[PDB]
Amino acid sequence: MVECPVCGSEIEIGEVELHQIVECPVCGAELEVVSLEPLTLEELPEVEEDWGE
Amino acid sequence: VECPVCGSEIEIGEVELHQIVECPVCGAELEVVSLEPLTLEELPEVEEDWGE
Amino acid sequence: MRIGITYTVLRREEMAIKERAGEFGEVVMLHEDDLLFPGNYDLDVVIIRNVSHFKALYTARLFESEGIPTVNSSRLIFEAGDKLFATLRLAGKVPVPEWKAALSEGGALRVPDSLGYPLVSKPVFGSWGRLLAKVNDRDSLEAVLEHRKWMKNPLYGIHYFQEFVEKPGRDIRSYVIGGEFVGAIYRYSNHWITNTARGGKAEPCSDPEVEELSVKAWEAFGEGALAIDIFESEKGLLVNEVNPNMEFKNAARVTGADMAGKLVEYAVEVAKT
Amino acid sequence: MRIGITYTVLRREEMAIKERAGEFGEVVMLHEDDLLFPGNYDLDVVIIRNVSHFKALYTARLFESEGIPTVNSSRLIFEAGDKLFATLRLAGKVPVPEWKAALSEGGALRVPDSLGYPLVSKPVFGSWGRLLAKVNDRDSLEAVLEHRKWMKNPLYGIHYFQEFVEKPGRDIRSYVIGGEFVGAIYRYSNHWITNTARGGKAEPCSDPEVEELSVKAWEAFGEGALAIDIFESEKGLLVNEVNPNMEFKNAARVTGADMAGKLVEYAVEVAKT
Amino acid sequence: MRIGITYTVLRREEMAIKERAGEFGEVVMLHEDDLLFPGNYDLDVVIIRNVSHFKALYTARLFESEGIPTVNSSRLIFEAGDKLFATLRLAGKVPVPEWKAALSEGGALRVPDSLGYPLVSKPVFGSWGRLLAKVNDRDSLEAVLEHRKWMKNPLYGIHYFQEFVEKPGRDIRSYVIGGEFVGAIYRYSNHWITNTGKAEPCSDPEVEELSVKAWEAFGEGALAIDIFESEKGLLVNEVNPNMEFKNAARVTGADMAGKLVEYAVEVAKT
Amino acid sequence: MRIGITYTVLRREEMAIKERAGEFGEVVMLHEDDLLFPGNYDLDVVIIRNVSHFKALYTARLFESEGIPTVNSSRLIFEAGDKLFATLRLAGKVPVPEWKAALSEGGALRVPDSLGYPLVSKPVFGSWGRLLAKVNDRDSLEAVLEHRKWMKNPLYGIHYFQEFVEKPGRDIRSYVIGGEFVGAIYRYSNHWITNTARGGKAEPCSDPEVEELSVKAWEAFGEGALAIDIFESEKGLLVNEVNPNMEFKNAARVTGADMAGKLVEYAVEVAKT
Ligand SMILES: Nc1ncnc2c1ncn2[C@@H]1O[C@H](COP(=O)(O)OP(=O)(O)O)[C@@H](O)[C@H]1O
Ligand SMILES: Nc1ncnc2c1ncn2[C@@H]1O[C@H](COP(=O)(O)OP(=O)(O)O)[C@@H](O)[C@H]1O
């Protein structure tokens, strides 16, 4: 398990990879796995003017 | 026309729209912004992709 | 087979592509921090998934310079990802909305004379519906041009406009990979800007005409994996835009089509080329 | 013969180009306000002289879309005008300073691993010595990358670096038009950045070695009119950069070379096709 | 008496100010390159003429920190120079256009419910006026907000709006220095943005009265005041504490430079 | 009692403040969408928690204009939130690092004659350790200045510098609310920038020297709830900066102090007068 930085809840996200995008099951926060060795979630950086498809 | 930098009335003669000129007295670089009538302005600001 | 995947973050898309790639050979996950050139890479193909369009473009070119083929290519990322270059390529081959391009505020002021109001203003390099403006009159045109002028990016000084198309509460998003249509959706919204990024709702689209037109639109480029944007109008279907770093998680869910697998299959085809 | 000249302001270079063009045919002066596409133009060639690099690129592409050839072409303006795309085409063909490219701040931190210190940071699309930085240590690298990070233009997220070359108080600027070496100057400065735009002082350069290297650098591209930047170093001459919208008023004044005339003669050759 | 003048470029206004100041004592011309703090400056007053409003503000504060009074003061430069702070100060005292302020784009979207269309969007810090927008409908509102959002300058997070005032093809710029009315001009144009050879003197006694009342809302300094005529009478749009006057001086014949310097020497004497 | 809380995003601290208030009266949560002026608000005091310093400033000023007091006040947010205005207020009263301010690039180039190398360049309005530079030589000073110039936010035209202070692997963040010391922490890092936003780690600080110095710093302003940044140096404690939008979640966690509760108490105190 790990703490959501928006909500504060402890959640299970499963077998994640580094820089992977996850949705918090409680608050619906979109988050980035910024570390695995110490499992750390983080809110995404700001959208740049050339981000997308 | 008056130079917008030094205030002097100056002689330019045959010139084109958006031509860069030089003031005879104060030597400021100026842009011909209009010919309706002949109107001088200082150079616009440099943008991040300006040059060669 | 060593298949590189180049990424900023791992969205559903990238997770699914990674899965599919693993069935064909060894996958090398390449975060942007890992990208250093000239470098010593041992790769048969790279699938380019960077969230930044310009980072995608430059990393594709760099891998090409190491002799490593790229999906999509740097040439396609640039042409398809620029609205104006793409419209130029599309204009021969498929119906597109009426458009104009101007190189100064002064020239942009004449655009209504050709297109009429309302018109749409948009930056040449954006995505996700960013900086799209519906301009109903001269006062709005001036405001839009004044703001674009003040913005730092010199690209915002390339003034691209289209006639405003009256859509029926939705537009169409289709996918063509290596010349094969893989699926399409409608994107519904109460607002005229329909991207799922803000956030249009996806429904499957089985329209055979969008399939035929999407393949034609792809053929104007003749390569790669493209997400195509199509509008319905009183004059019929119009091709608006093509996107060289496709998102598809909703499109996949709603159509049941395997966009990710098709992209990877195409990548293994170019790896053997 | 109708020869177009596209321009932002008419510098000395543009007035000279205009005069020479008038010896070969009718000259159509096209300020940016006069550029609106699609449009009806009756022109055999356009000489692209917009001060903005990006406006030059897009106006070339638009004239090409109208079947009007352009000097320089959109392809050359894009490739030559980008530090990274240009060194990629120069690499293996002529000697260049040691270089490194990264795609993120975290990747850029590793650039000194290859290049050592001091190194040179520069933006991929710049000119006139703009935003050039000499970085002597880690703290300086961090400062530069911190600032690039917060700048709006996504292009500042492409991190391009060279080894700092110890030049003898000057560098070299040469000109090659259609394969013909037309002349060269030294640009002297007591600052390591020697551009004449920043106070650099022009002096004629007659080294036969720079002529041959200049032609070879041009042949890496294979078309157009290029101002080439060369460095003298303890390991001989290195090609640094090429420039597709050449300034030359100081170079022509100092060498007697008629860069304007040669540029127009090349334009007239491309008009014939 | 030692009078400093801070400047970005030496132009007509600065040379005029220097000349009048020369009558009262020693003049010290301070280019921005000469401004370094903390430092030792031997000055009784500083006349602030930096072209940037932000540089003006900081240089005034910095001189104040060395015990040197400044015309205009750092307090007036901020209060009067910011559109929002300024209208809050004017609102109790003189008529102003109806206005609205929001702190997010969602709030800004409700502004037309108060102000109606057309409305005017402008930045709080602006002076050049390139970012002024006449917003006629919701699509234009959204376009303006979307562009401001992507400028990522946090000062565009203050969304300030006014009703669009139907002016009679001109507006008014008056000058009040130390409480004294020194002159006013009409600025004519066929565009709704009249901002400045289409100027002439304004001798409407009513703008003189209103102009002094506007200045009295701040109670100090040298201000240019922008006034609109409308169906419901004169309205004070904004005040400007950096005061360009070269045009208004020529058009009206008022010695604007001299009045500014005179005020500065009275300030120098505490 | 009716206590307004103004916020950008609901998180731990805002939620902690919400519950401590409410013990005193009715709490009204005001999202930035709810802020429209002139407006009819029925509040005895507003606790200003907007993430943007600028939005906080204007929000405070706007509530004051409706006769509603604010914690912190617009005046304090202005003076304390701007680093240069703040150090000017501190200069007489408490030791600060040596500093210098210039109004142009040319003046800024003279700064190291006063401060020596290395020195620290930072924006007057910044937080979270963003755009900080440690400048070891002239080349770096030039680089930082070049980049500031091309950002074209007029605020970066104010060039604020400090001597580089050699801290012992950490710095100190103390909290003073209405003149009462409520707690302090150490922030540890092996980078010279020790922000917890930057990956710094917080521990309790019990040093009575910093408690004394914290209250003295607060007193230089004479109002509000402030977070106070202190450095330990070879020449004793120094007050680097003050912050009128105190983040405290780590400080409260690690100290056991009720920052939320103290803040609310002060606000009800402010509501009285
Ligand atoms: N000319 C137009 N007429 C009507 N709607 C448009 C027009 N241009 C764009 N849109 C709407 O805005 C959306 C985004 O525009 P698009 O051109 O695809 O840019 P992006 O690359 O940001 O998706 C489209 O999907 C469509 O819903
Ligand atoms: N790696 C380097 N070593 C030494 N000097 C350099 C280096 N790169 C650039 N310079 C100096 O800075 C000038 C401008 O750099 P350049 O790469 O030509 O960019 P621009 O397109 O801005 O001219 C060069 O003419 C040269 O004097």
Ligand SMILES: Nc1ncnc2c1ncn2[C@@H]1O[C@H](COP(=O)(O)OP(=O)(O)O)[C@@H](O)[C@H]1O
């Ligand atoms: N609310 C408005 N209604 C009508 N015209 C306006 C309004 N606001 C500004 N203008 C016009 O635009 C000009 C510049 O506006 P202003 O508010 O002074 O911005 P700036 O501070 O850039 O001068 C004014 O002199 C006036 O002519």
Ligand SMILES: Nc1ncnc2c1ncn2[C@@H]1O[C@H](COP(=O)(O)OP(=O)(O)O)[C@@H](O)[C@H]1O
């Ligand atoms: N002059 C300096 N010397 C040494 N370290 C500094 C200096 N200025 C800032 N720092 C370090 O950087 C951190 C952030 O700087 P600060 O001035 O607080 O800016 P911010 O408001 O962005 O936090 C400080 O907590 C300190 O650790």
Ligand SMILES: [Mg+2]
């Ligand atoms: Mg798109």
Ligand SMILES: [Mg+2]
């Ligand atoms: Mg689209």
Ligand SMILES: [Mg+2]
């Ligand atoms: Mg160049």
Ligand SMILES: [Mg+2]
């Ligand atoms: Mg060069």
Ligand SMILES: [Zn+2]
């Ligand atoms: Zn959560």
Ligand SMILES: [Zn+2]
């Ligand atoms: Zn002159």
